[PDB]
Amino acid sequence: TENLYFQSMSFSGKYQLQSQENFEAFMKAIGLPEELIQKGKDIKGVSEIVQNGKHFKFTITAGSKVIQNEFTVGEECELETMTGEKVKTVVQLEGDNKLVTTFKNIKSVTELNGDIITNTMTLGDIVFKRISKRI
């Protein structure tokens, strides 16, 4: 048995969504009714992340829906996507401040630069970007 020691900043805390880039084309892309899209286009609430080592619990307010997932880094956990549905993907740790996973052709990056967190999902030529600050 080998031991691999890694380390990250600390993603714990609630983040207030401030800037959202390209919510429409991307939401519309994944196949979301234009209703929900329009019901959630400029809502900006709070998301929460509770990190304990590599055990992650995170609640997201995506438009008008509160999604809740859990994962462990490098472990194959199943997540619920923005829409009604479910996938299996592995979340990896890049550097000391990146969570990176790909699932369904969607590439998810979550960067933490100090007190602010940028979430970038690029599905093709579409780049959905959300910028929240810890509080």
Side-chain angles (χ1 to χ4, degrees):
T1 176
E2 285 302 321
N3 291 77
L4 292 77
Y5 304 128
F6 294 75
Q7 189 192 75
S8 83
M9 239 30 264
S10 189
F11 293 93
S12 299
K14 291 106 70 182
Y15 301 68
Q16 172 64 65
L17 181 62
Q18 298 184 300
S19 176
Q20 195 168 207
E21 230 271 338
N22 259 55
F23 175 82
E24 326 236 286
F26 172 91
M27 252 356 163
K28 173 174 182 172
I30 54 179
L32 229 217
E34 188 211 43
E35 216 27 44
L36 299 178
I37 299 182
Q38 291 299 313
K39 223 185 201 205
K41 47 185 277 259
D42 7 60
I43 286 171
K44 296 192 203 300
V46 191
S47 282
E48 182 168 54
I49 302 174
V50 193
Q51 177 209 27
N52 289 70
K54 24 105 136 160
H55 293 103
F56 281 79
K57 259 177 309 167
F58 78 103
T59 328
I60 323 311
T61 65
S64 56
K65 313 259 218 83
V66 169
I67 297 144
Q68 223 165 219
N69 282 287
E70 281 165 352
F71 62 96
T72 286
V73 179
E75 171 173 73
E76 198 176 289
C77 311
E78 94 145 64
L79 315 174
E80 187 202 274
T81 93
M82 319 251 114
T83 107
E85 131 181 69
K86 216 130 277 198
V87 294
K88 276 159 119 188
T89 188
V90 190
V91 169
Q92 209 64 62
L93 159 57
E94 248 180 61
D96 66 6
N97 70 341
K98 285 190 173 181
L99 289 177
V100 199
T101 187
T102 304
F103 62 91
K104 294 192 299 142
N105 293 121
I106 304 180
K107 168 96 224 226
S108 187
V109 179
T110 305
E111 198 163 343
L112 198 225
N113 279 282
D115 272 326
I116 88 84
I117 198 149
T118 315
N119 184 266
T120 323
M121 306 189 183
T122 96
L123 174 45
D125 295 348
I126 294 171
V127 194
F128 188 14
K129 180 158 123 278
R130 321 171 84 216
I131 311 175
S132 322
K133 99 213 138 150
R134 187 191 287 133
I135 70 201

